[PDB]
């Protein structure tokens, strides 16, 4: 099947939205009750295993469009709302364990809530990709979801983080390096699915080689990106994408092999197929102690190897026209170091589904805003834990 590593969801303290002499009137008093219930509806969903994306889309639309009122204003799209700094939100981090981080900024709350939804999308894709019963149609979802997620992350990174007041701390999800890794990881994960499909429908070996190669480049990039963080938290993750780029490079050499043999070129059809199986060996060496290496998130046990069932045929077929050449069973001359691969893939590459927040709620009118009188402003609960599975 499919196997993806999942860092834990972000947790946050209850926000009541209760201001007293500050809220005068029915409409303003209403909107604080809508922000209250809607944020909570969105939060119970995360923990909830019964939720499909169309439910999620809605719950998030609701909140974020109500949340907007605290950030920008309905009159000038360029000028900022008086409420942005009113409330203080406390969120935890995927890699930081139980330690909360707090800011009184509505941008912080938005960027972090949204982050949790993008994280959610992937988790939904991940849970949905574990089953053996995968349907052509259900794959379109796992795949689409990963792009919806890569899109959200992208948006947050380059459209939003810039707006934050305080700079973000190293090793916090709201750091643009850490986001950049998620976007990429998401894109990569999707393509895994595509590969899984391309293989199943018998597409051309050149294709699956290039697609699988470019995918290994992704975990390359997300290893380099992440590389700037203290190894304590990023340890397990870095090993898994280090592991993944390695498992998918095997596919590259392997499926590239069939592009040489069929091309009537032997020595490098072998040295490659060897390289593929040398790597699939190291890949499992990496799985084993990624399982040993401690870090946030559950350990996913890698499932599908048809890799052999593929290599098997190639091996058989290769020795057939090469029997008179390098081998059998004693190979010369077979090139010392492995054949370089620079391949671009023209099919199956993933572009993040462009994301945007919903415009500010129509419930925000100048009267509804002026009904929050900041002139009248004059102890904390704690973050309610995630408890995933």
């Amino acid at each position: 099947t499919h196997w993806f590593h999942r860092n834990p969801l972000k947790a946050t303290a209850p926000v009541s939205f209760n201001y007293y002499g500050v809220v005068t009137g029915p409409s303003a008093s209403k909107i604080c009750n809508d922000l209250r219930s809607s944020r909570a509806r969105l939060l119970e969903l995360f923990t909830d295993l019964s939720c499909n994306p169309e439910m999620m889309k809605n719950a998030a639309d609701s909140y974020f469009s109500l949340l907007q009122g605290f950030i920008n204003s309905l009159d000038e799209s360029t000028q900022e709302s008086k409420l942005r700094y009113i409330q203080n939100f406390k969120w935890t981090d995927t890699l930081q364990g139980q330690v909360p981080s707090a800011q009184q900024d509505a941008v912080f709350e938005l960027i972090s809530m949204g982050f949790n939804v993008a994280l959610w999308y992937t988790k939904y894709a991940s849970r949905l990709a574990g089953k053996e019963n995968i349907t052509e149609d259900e794959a379109k979802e796992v795949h689409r979801s990963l792009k919806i997620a890569a899109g959200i992350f992208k948006h947050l990174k380059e459209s939003h983080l810039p707006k934050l007041i305080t700079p973000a701390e190293k090793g916090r999800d709201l750091e643009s390096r850490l986001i950049e890794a998620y976007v990429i990881q998401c894109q990569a994960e999707a393509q895994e699915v595509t590969i899984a499909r391309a293989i199943e429908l018998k597409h051309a070996p050149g294709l699956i080689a290039a697609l699988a190669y470019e995918t290994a480049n992704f975990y390359q990039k997300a290893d380099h990106t992440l590389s700037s963080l203290e190894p304590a938290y990023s340890a397990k993750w870095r090993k898994y994408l280090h592991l993944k780029m390695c498992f998918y490079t095997a596919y590259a050499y392997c499926y590239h092999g069939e592009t040489l043999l069929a091309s009537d070129k032997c020595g490098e059809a072998i040295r490659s197929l060897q390289e593929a199986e040398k790597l699939y060996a190291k890949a499992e060496a990496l799985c084993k102690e990624y399982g040993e290496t401690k870090g946030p998130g559950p350990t996913v046990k890698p499932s599908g190897h048809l890799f052999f069932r593929k290599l098997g045929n190639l091996v058989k077929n290769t020795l057939e026209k090469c029997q008179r050449e390098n081998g059998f069973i004693y190979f010369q001359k077979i090139p010392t170091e492995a054949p370089q691969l620079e391949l671009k893939a023209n099919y199956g590459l993933v572009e993040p589904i462009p994301f945007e927040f919903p415009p500010t709620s129509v419930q925000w009118t100048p009267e509804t805003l002026a009904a929050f009188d900041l002139t009248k402003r004059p102890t904390k609960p704690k973050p309610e834990e995630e408890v995933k599975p």
Partner: peptide
Amino acid sequence: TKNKDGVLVDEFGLPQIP
């Protein structure tokens, strides 16, 4: 649908054939 180069394409971005 089709892609930029004009090729009939799987919903998955892949080429389309029997």
